Tab-separated table of C-alpha atoms and ligand atoms in Angstrom:
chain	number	residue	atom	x	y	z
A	277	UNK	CA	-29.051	3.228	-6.406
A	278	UNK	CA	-28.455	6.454	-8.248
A	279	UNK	CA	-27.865	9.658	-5.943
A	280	UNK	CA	-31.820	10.966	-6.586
A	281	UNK	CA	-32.526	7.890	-4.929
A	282	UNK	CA	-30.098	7.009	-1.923
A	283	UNK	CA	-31.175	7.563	1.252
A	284	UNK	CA	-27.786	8.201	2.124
A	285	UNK	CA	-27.259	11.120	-0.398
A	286	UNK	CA	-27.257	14.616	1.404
A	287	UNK	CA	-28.004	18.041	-0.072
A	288	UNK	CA	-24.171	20.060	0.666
A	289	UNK	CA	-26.103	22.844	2.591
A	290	UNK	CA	-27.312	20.489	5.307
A	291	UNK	CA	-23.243	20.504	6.674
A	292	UNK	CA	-21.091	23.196	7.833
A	293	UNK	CA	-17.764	22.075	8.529
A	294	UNK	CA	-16.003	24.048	11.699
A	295	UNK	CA	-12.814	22.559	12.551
A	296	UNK	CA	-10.065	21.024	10.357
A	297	UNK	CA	-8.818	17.791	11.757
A	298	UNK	CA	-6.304	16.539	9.122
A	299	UNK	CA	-5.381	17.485	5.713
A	300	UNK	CA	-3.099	14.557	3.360
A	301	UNK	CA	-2.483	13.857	-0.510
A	302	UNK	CA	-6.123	12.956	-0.835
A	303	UNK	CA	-7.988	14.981	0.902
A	304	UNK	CA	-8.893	16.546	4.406
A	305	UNK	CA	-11.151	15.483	7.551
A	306	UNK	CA	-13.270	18.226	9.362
A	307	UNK	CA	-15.891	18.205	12.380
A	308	UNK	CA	-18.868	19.901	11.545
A	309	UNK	CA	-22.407	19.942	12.054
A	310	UNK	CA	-25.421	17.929	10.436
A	311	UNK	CA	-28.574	20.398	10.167
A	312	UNK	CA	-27.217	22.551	12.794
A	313	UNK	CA	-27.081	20.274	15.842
A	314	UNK	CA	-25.844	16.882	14.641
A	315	UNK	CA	-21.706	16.434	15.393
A	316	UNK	CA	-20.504	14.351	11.898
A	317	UNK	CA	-17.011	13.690	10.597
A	318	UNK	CA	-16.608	14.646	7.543
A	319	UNK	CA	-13.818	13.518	4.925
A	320	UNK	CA	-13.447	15.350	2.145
A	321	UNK	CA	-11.762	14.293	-1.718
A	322	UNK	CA	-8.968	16.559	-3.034
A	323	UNK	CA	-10.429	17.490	-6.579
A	324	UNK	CA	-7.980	15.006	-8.699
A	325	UNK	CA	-5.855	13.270	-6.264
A	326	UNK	CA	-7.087	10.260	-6.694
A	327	UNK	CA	-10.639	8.751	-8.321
A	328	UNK	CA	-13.885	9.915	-7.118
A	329	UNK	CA	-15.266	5.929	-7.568
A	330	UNK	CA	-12.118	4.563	-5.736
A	331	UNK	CA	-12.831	7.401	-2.911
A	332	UNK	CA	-16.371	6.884	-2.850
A	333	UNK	CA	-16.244	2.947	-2.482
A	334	UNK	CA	-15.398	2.973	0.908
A	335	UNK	CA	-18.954	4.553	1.465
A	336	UNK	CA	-20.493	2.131	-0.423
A	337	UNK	CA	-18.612	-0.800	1.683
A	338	UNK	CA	-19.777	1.042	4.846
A	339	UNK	CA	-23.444	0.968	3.630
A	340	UNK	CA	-22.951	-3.233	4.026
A	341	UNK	CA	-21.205	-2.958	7.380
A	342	UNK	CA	-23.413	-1.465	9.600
A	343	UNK	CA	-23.000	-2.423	13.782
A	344	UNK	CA	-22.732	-0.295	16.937
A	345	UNK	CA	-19.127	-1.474	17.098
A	346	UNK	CA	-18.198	-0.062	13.598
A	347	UNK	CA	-18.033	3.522	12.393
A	348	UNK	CA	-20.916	4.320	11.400
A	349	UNK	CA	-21.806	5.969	7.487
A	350	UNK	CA	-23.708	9.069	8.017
A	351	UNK	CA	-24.471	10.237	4.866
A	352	UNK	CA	-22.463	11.337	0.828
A	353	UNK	CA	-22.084	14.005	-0.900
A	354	UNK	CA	-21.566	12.632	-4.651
A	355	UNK	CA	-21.274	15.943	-6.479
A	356	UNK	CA	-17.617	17.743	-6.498
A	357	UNK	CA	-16.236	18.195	-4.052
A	358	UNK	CA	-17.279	14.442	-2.929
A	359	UNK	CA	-17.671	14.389	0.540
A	360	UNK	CA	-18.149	11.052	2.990
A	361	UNK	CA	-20.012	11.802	6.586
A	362	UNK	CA	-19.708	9.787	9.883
A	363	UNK	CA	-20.555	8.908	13.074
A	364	UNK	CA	-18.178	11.342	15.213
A	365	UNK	CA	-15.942	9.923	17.249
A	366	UNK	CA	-15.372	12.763	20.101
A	367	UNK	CA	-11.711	11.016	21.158
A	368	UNK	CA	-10.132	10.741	18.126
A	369	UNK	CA	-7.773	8.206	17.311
A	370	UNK	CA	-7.145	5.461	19.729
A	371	UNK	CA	-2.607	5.426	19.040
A	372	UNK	CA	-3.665	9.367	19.645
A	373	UNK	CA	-5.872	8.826	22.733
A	374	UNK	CA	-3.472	6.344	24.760
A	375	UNK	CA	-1.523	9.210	24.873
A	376	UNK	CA	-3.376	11.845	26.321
A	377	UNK	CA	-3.542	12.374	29.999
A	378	UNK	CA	-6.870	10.808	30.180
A	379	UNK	CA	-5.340	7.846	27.911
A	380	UNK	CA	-2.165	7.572	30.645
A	381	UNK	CA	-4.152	7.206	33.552
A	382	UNK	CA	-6.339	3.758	32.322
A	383	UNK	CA	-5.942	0.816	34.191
A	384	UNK	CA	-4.881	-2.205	32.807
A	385	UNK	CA	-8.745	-3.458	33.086
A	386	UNK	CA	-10.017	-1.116	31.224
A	387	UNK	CA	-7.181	-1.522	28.439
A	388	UNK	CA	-8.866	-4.892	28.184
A	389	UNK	CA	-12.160	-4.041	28.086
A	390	UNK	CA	-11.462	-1.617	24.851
A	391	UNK	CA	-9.270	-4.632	23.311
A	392	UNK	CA	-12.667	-6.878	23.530
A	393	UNK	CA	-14.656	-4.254	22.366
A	394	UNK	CA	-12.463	-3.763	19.444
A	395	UNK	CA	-12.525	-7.876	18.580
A	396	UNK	CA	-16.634	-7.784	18.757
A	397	UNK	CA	-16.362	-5.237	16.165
A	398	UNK	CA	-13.900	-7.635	14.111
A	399	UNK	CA	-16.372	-10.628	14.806
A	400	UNK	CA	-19.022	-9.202	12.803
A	401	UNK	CA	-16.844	-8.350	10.555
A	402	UNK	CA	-15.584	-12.158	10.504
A	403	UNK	CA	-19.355	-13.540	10.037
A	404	UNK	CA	-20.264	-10.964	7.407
A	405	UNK	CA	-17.637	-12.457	5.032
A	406	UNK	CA	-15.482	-9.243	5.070
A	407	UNK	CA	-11.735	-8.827	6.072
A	408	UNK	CA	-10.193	-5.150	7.240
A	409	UNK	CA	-6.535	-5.220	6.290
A	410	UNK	CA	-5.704	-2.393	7.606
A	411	UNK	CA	-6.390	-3.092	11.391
A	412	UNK	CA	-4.098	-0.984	13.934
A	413	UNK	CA	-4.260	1.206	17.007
A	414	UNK	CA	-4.684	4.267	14.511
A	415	UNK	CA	-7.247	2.875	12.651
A	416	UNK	CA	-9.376	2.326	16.224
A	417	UNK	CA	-11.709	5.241	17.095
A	418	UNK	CA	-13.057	6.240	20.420
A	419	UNK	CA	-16.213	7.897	21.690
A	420	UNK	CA	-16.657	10.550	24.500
A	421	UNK	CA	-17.814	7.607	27.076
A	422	UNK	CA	-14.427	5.401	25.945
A	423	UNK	CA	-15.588	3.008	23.538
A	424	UNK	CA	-14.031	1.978	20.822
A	425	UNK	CA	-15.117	1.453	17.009
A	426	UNK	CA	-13.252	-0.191	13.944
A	427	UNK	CA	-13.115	2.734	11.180
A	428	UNK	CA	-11.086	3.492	7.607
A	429	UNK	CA	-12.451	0.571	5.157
A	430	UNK	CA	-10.706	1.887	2.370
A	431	UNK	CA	-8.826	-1.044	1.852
A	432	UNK	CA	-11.771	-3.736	3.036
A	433	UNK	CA	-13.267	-6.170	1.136
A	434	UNK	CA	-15.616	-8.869	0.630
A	435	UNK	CA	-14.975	-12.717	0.343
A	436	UNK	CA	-16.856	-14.248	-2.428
A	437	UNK	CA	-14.214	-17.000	-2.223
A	438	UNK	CA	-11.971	-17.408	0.998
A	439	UNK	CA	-8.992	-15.271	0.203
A	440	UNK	CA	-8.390	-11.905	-1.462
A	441	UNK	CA	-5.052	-11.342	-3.701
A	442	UNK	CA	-4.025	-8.136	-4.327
A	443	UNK	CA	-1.705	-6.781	-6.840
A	444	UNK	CA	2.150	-8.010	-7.181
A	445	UNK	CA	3.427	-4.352	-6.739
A	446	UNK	CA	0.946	-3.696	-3.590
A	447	UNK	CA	2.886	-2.604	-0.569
A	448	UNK	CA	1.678	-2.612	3.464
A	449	UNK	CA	2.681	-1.553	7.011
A	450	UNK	CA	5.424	-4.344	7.645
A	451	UNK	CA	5.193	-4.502	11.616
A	452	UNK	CA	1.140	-4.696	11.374
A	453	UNK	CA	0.919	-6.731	8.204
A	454	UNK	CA	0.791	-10.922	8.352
A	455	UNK	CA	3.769	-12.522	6.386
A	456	UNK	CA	1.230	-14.449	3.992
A	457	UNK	CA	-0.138	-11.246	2.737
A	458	UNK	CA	3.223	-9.323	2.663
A	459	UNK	CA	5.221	-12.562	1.276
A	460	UNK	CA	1.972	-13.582	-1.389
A	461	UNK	CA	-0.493	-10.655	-1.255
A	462	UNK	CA	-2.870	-13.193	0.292
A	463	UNK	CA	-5.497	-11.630	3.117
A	464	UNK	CA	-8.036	-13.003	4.957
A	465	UNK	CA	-9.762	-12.548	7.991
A	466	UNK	CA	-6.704	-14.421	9.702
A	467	UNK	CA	-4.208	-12.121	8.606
A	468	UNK	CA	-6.156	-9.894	9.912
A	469	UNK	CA	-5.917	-11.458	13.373
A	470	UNK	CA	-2.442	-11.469	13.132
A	471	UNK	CA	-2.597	-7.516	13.173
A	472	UNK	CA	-5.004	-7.461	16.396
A	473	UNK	CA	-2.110	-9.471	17.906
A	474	UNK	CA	0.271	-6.252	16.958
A	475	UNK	CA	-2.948	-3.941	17.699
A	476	UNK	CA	-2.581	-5.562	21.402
A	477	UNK	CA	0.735	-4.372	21.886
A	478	UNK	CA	-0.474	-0.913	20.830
A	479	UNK	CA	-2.752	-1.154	23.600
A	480	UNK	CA	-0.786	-1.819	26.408
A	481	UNK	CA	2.210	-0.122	25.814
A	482	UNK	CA	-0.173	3.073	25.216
A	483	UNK	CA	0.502	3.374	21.224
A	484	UNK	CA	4.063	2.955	21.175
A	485	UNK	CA	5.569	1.299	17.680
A	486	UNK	CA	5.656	-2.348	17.463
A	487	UNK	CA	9.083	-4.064	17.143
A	488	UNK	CA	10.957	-1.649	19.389
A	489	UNK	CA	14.103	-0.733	17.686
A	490	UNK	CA	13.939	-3.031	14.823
A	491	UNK	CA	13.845	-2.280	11.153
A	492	UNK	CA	11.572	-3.869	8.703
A	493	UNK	CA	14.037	-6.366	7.670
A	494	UNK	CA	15.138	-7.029	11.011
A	495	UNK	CA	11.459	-8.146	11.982
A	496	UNK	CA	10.657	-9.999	8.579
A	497	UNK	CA	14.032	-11.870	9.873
A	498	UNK	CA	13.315	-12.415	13.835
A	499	UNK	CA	10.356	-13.721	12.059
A	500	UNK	CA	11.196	-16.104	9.665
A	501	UNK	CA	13.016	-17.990	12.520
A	502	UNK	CA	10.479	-18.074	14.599
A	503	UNK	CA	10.524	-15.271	16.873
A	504	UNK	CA	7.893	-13.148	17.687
A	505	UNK	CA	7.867	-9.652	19.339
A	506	UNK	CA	9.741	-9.162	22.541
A	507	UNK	CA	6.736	-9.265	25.507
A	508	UNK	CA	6.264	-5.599	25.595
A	509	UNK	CA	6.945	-4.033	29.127
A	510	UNK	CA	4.699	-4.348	31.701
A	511	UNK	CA	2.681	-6.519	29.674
A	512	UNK	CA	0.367	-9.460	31.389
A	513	UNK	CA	1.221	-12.407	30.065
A	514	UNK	CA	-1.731	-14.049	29.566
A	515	UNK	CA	-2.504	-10.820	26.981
A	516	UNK	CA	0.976	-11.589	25.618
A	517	UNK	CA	-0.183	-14.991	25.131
A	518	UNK	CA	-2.956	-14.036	24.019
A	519	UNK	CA	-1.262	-12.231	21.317
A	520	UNK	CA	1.142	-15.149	20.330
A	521	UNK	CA	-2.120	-17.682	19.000
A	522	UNK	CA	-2.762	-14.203	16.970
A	523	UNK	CA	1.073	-14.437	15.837
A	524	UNK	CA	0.921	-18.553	14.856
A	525	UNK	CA	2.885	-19.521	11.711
A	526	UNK	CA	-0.545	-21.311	10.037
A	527	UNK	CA	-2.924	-18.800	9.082
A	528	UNK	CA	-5.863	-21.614	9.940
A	529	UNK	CA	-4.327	-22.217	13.100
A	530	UNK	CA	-4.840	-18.480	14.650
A	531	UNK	CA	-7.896	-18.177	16.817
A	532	UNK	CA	-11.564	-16.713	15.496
A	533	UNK	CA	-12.283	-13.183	16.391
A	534	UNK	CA	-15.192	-14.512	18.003
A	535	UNK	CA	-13.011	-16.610	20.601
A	536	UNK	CA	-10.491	-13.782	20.857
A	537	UNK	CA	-13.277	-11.443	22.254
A	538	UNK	CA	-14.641	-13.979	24.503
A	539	UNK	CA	-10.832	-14.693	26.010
A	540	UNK	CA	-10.747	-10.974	26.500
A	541	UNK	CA	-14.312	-10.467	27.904
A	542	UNK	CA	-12.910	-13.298	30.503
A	543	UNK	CA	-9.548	-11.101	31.335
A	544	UNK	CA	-11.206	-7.653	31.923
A	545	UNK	CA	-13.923	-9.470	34.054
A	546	UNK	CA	-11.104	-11.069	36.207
A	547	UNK	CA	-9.478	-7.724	36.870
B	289	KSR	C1	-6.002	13.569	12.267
B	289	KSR	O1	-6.410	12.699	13.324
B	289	KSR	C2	-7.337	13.105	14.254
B	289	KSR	C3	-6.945	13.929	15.316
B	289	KSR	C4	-7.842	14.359	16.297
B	289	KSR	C5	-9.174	13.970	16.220
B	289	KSR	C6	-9.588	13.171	15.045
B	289	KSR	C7	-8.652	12.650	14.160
B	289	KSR	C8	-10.947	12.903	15.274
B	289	KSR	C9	-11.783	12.057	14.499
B	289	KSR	C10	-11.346	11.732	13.253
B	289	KSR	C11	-12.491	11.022	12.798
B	289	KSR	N1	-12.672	10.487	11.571
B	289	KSR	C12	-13.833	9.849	11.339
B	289	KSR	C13	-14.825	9.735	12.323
B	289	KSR	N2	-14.675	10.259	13.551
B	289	KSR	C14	-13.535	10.927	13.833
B	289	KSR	N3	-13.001	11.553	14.899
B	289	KSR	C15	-11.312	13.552	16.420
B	289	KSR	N4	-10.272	14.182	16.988
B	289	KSR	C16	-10.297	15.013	18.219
């Protein structure tokens, strides 16, 4: 629909952004204020850094993916500078938020609890025919009452047919990244369980890197032989196992998201 039309177009004067929270190559990310009393994210597009439809698609993605366990569109601004408004998440990043003194002081139960909250947002992702391909600790946002929502779809996309192949010269996080779609390009949603497994280790070992001390080619290597990551420390090792059916060699043969939330639903319960 054309901006004089869509319900999620905003007039600029409804927002007032007060605090900067990032600034990159393409543009910045504020906190402001919908009409005065609303708290809304707001990401901004650096005039020229990159296109205004490539920037703006990831609101028109959002406008399909709507569920309490997503981050939620809010509203666009599609005159220059093009803004995109969200749901605000009051914690920030979760990688960020582990690491806080609030972060350091969860217990292992609730560390669960925000992994299965995290895989029910993936599950509806699953069923709506979509995959993330970006999924990560940093990419996890949480709320003021420490729940957890899947954000940044830039790079998410719709299935028509099973898998999505990107370009030859594309290039993605290594650690987080499943060795189908690093080796061929290939995604679906089961590469994208492969990075929950990794997100899991994020998780428990409060947002440190993956792979401790290895290089990219070191872990493409470990890899290709059939290792997997070292159990992180002080990990349970049902979650480690957890993580290894995310980490199978056979893309088919890696659980559902579905099932994954379920298992997880099961270990915070039991705790
Ligand atoms: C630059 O990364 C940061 C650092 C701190 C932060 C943030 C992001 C956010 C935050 C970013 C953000 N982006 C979209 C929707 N909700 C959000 N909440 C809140 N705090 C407190």
């Amino acid at each position: 629909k054309p901006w004089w039309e869509d319900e999620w177009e905003v007039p600029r004067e409804t927002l007032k952004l007060v605090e900067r929270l990032g600034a990159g190559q393409f543009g910045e990310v504020w906190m402001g204020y919908y009409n005065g009393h609303t708290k809304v994210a707001v990401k901004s597009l650096k005039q020229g850094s990159m296109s205004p439809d490539a920037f703006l698609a990831e609101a028109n993605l959002m406008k399909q993916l709507q569920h309490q366990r997503l981050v939620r569109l809010y509203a666009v601004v599609t005159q220059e500078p093009i803004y995109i408004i969200t749901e605000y998440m009051e914690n920030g990043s979760l990688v960020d938020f582990l690491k806080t003194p609030s972060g350091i002081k969860l217990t292992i139960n609730k560390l669960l609890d925000m992994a299965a909250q995290i895989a029910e947002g993936m599950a509806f992702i699953e069923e709506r025919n979509y995959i993330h391909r970006d999924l990560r600790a940093a990419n996890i946002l949480v709320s003021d009452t420490l729940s957890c929502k899947i954000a940044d779809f830039g790079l998410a996309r719709l299935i028509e047919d099973n898998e999505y192949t990107a370009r030859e010269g594309a290039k993605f996080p290594i650690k987080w990244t499943a060795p189908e779609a690093i080796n061929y390009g290939t995604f679906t949603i089961k590469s994208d369980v492969w990075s929950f497994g990794i997100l899991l280790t994020e998780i428990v070992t409060h947002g440190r890197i993956p792979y401790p001390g290895m290089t990219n080619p070191e872990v493409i290597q470990n890899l290709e032989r059939g290792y997997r990551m070292v159990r992180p420390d002080n990990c349970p090792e049902e979650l480690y196992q957890l993580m290894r059916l995310c980490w199978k060699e056979r893309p088919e043969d890696r659980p559902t998201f579905d099932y994954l939330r379920s298992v997880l639903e099961d270990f915070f319960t039991a705790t």
